[PDB]
Amino acid sequence: EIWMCIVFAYIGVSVVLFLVSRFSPYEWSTNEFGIFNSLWFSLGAFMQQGCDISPRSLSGRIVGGVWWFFTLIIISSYTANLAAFLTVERMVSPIESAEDLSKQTEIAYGTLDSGSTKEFFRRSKIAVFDKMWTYMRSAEPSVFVRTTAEGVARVRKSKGKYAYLLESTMNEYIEQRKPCDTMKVGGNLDSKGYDIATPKGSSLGTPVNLAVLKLSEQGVLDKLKNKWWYDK
Amino acid sequence: IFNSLWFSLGAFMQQGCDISPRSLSGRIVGGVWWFFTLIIISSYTANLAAFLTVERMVSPIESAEDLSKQTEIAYGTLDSGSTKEFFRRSKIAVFDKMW
Amino acid sequence: TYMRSAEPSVFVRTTAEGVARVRKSKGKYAYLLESTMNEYIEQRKPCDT
Amino acid sequence: GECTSALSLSNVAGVFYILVGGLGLAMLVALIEFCYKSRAEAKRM
Amino acid sequence: LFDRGVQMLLTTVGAFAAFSLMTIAVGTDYWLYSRGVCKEEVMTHSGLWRTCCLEGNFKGLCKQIDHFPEDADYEADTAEYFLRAVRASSIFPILSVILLFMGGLCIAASEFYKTRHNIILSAGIFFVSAGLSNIIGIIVYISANAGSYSYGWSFYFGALSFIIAEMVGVLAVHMFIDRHKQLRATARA
């Protein structure tokens, strides 16, 4: 609307300037301000560029002065608003740590409908994670998601307005899969692990434990991780 | 051609000009050039204000492979310990390069 | 003295309608109430008080 | 507890009003000057 | 820009077209497409006097603008009061319509008693003043409205009427200038 009214004001100012400059037969001219020349002078004045001619009559100079003031205000407003836009975009910082996510509230975030994540959130004593669990508990609409597939689909559709919380392994797997739209960001909130499980009181426990430790020290475990998380 | 170059240079720096176009095509060229100059100068001033208002410190290294590729920044581990042993019996390309 | 000589009547029957009128008046009404209830209502949706 | 935009015409409406007022004032001045000069010419002839 | 009779006809049709466009725009309630109530929120098309439902449960069952709403209007400053009063009265669009009609009457009467050249000058002044008052009316309307939406065809009809009025005023002033040049040429000889 501002641009529309600027064009209308330009047309009106040019027409009025031409009229007040050439309508009087007693000034017949002493001024080279035709309709085309009036339009040219107005266009030059708006762009704050040097004009070849300037009005000499009282009405012409009044029109020129008010057009100059309008042009100054509009150009300064445009520069100031563009500076504000650029500064606001520059100040925008994504979220890395979970604390930054906790302080912020623009982007929604929630965990699965069930699982050990819920128990970790509830039983935690960290102030950040406590307020996190309160925020999920009291939130509308339900950030809670039935399954992991629905969670990743929702995160993909929400175009950054949603965040998901899940195992780092599955998160890395989803990151390394097409179409490469999601990223794991930050550090692991807690510590867990996957271990080989054997029946109580079995002869297979001690040497499987020795085997997995030897495998980790030999580094082949990291090779398997890289091989199917990044290589494939 | 020299005067046209001078006029365009004066218009771009918003320093006026002793002479101005009079034809329709010349004035169309002048108008579009003036609009371009206005937009570009305003954009430059706004972006410089944004740069001077917000300070964005950026670390050069964000991952170990960046250290592997670069050479200006040195890095090392303990002369004898778990880290040096780990970099010792590692067959990964990146860790081998760091060795 | 202003309260007893204010029209329309500014007194409210119960805190619920007082908060409702505060939210509806769009900055044209203030409610004098206990600070605990004030803090509780402030921390309630949709943060219009 | 559970609890920049583009410049609009209203932001610069005043400068538009001032511009139109200046245009009208200049027009009235020009019309008065024309009428006065026509009256002077009629008195002369 | 050539001859006089063709210019006369062009100016007459331009003035009539501008006046017709504005008389349509003032009397047409299609100025803004926006969400609102015309009696839940639904998309409706509003004008200067009545806002009217679109794809609603009751299409065409539609109502005047709430220019001075009750139920805690919250009041405002004197400048805002004059703003809302001018918007509600819509004094400037009607003033531009009146000025356009006066200019049309002036150009029509210029044919009779062709020796009074000031009539066409008055017509040009009236047309350009109508254009300026149209600028004021458009500005005040947009300012009052913004106190997702689109502008209907009547708003652009008014804008085109302003443009045509300014063009007709320029042509009339050129006509006056040509007539006085002809008088000077015939007096010199």
What CATH number should be reported for the domain holding residue E128?
Answer: 1.20.140.150
The reply, when asked if residue B82 is annotated as ligand binding, is yes
The residue to which tokens 């007893």 are assigned: C4
Q: Is residue E1 one of the residues assigned to a domain?
A: no
The residue to which tokens 């508990």 are assigned: A137
The reply, when asked if residue A116 is annotated as ligand binding, is yes
Q: What is the DSSP string of C9-44?
A: ----SSHHHHHHHHHHTTSS------HHHHHHHHTS
Tell me the β-bridge partners of E150.
Answer: E33
In angstroms, rounded to a whole number, what is the distance separating the alpha carbons of residues E74 and B43? 41
Strands A162-164, A108-110: pairing is parallel
Structure tokens at D44: 């002369």
Which of left, alpha, beta for A186 (phi over 0: left; psi -120 to 50: alpha)? left
In angstroms, rounded to a whole number, what is the distance separating the alpha carbons of residues A157 and A170? 19
Q: Does E124 touch chain A (CB under 8 A)?
A: yes
Q: Does A12 touch chain D (CB under 8 A)?
A: yes
The closest alpha carbon to A135, from A166, A98, A80, A82, belongs to A98
Residue type, A168: S
The alpha carbon of residue D4 is apart from the nearest alpha carbon of chain E, in Å, by 17
Check if the beta carbon of residue E120 is closer than 8 Å to that of residue E15. Answer: no
In angstroms, rounded to a whole number, what is the distance separating the alpha carbons of residues A207 and E179? 115
| Touching partners of C (3+ C-beta pairs < 8 Å) | D, E
How many other CB atoms are there within 10 angstroms of residue A99's CB atom? 16
Check if the beta carbon of residue E170 is closer than 8 Å to that of residue E2. Answer: no
Query: Interior CA angle at B96 toward B93 and B98, to 5°?
Result: 115
In angstroms, rounded to a whole number, what is the distance separating the alpha carbons of residues A14 and B59? 55
Check if the beta carbon of residue D16 is closer than 8 Å to that of residue A5. Answer: yes
Tell me the β-bridge partners of E46.
Answer: E32, E51
The residue to which tokens 């990044």 are assigned: A230
Q: Is residue E90 one of the residues assigned to a domain?
A: yes
The residue to which tokens 């443009």 are assigned: E163
Residues 6 or more apart whose CB falls under 8 angstroms from that of B63 comprise none
DSSP letter assigned to residue A231 = I
In angstroms, rounded to a whole number, what is the distance separating the alpha carbons of residues B81 and E33? 74
Query: Hey, are the CB atoms on B50 and A223 less than 8 Å from each other?
Result: no
What are residue A163's phi and psi, to 5 degrees? -130, 150
Check if the beta carbon of residue A13 is closer than 8 Å to that of residue A71. Answer: no
Q: What is the CA radius of gyration of chain D?
A: 23
What are residue E43's phi and psi, to 5 degrees? -70, 125
The residue to which tokens 């299409």 are assigned: E59
Q: Is residue E52 one of the residues assigned to a domain?
A: yes
Check if the beta carbon of residue E129 is closer than 8 Å to that of residue E177. Answer: no
Q: How many CA atoms lie within 13 A of A207 on its CB side?
A: 3
In angstroms, rounded to a whole number, what is the distance separating the alpha carbons of residues A75 and B43? 12
Query: Interior CA angle at A102 toward A96 and A107, to 5°?
Result: 75
Chain A residue with Cα closest to E171 = A35
Check if the beta carbon of residue E158 is closer than 8 Å to that of residue E25. Answer: yes
Q: Does E69 touch chain C (CB under 8 A)?
A: no
Query: Interior CA angle at E182 toward E179 and E186, to 5°?
Result: 145
Check if the beta carbon of residue E117 is closer than 8 Å to that of residue E109. Answer: no
Helices (H), E41-152: 78-89, 91-110, 118-145
In angstroms, rounded to a whole number, what is the distance separating the alpha carbons of residues B72 and A183? 30
| Touching partners of B (3+ C-beta pairs < 8 Å) | A
Q: Is residue E62 one of the residues assigned to a domain?
A: yes
The residue to which tokens 């929120």 are assigned: E41
Q: Which residues of E touch C8 (CB under 8 A)?
A: none
Q: Which helix (H) or strand (E) holds E28?
A: none
Among E125, E135, E176, the residue with its CB nearest the CB of A12 is: E135
CB pairs A-E closer than 8 Å: 47
Give residue E22's domain range. 6-184
Q: Does A26 touch chain D (CB under 8 A)?
A: yes
Q: Does C36 touch chain D (CB under 8 A)?
A: no
Q: How many CA atoms lie within 13 A of B80 on its CB side?
A: 0
Core vs surface per residue E4-21: b (16+ CB within 10 A) or e = eeebbeebbebbbebbeb
How many other CB atoms are there within 10 angstroms of residue E172's CB atom? 29
Chain A residue with Cα closest to B52 = A87
In angstroms, rounded to a whole number, what is the distance separating the alpha carbons of residues E140 and E83? 7
Query: Hey, are the CB atoms on D10 and E147 less than 8 Å from each other?
Result: yes
Among D12, D29, D38, the residue with its CB nearest the CB of A62 is: D29
Q: Is residue E189 one of the residues assigned to a domain?
A: no
Provide the number of structural domains found in chain E.
Answer: 1
Structure tokens at E35: 């969400």
Chain A residue with Cα closest to D26 = A59
Core vs surface per residue E59-98: b (16+ CB within 10 A) or e = eeebeebeeeeeeeeeeeeeeeeebbebbeebebbebbbe
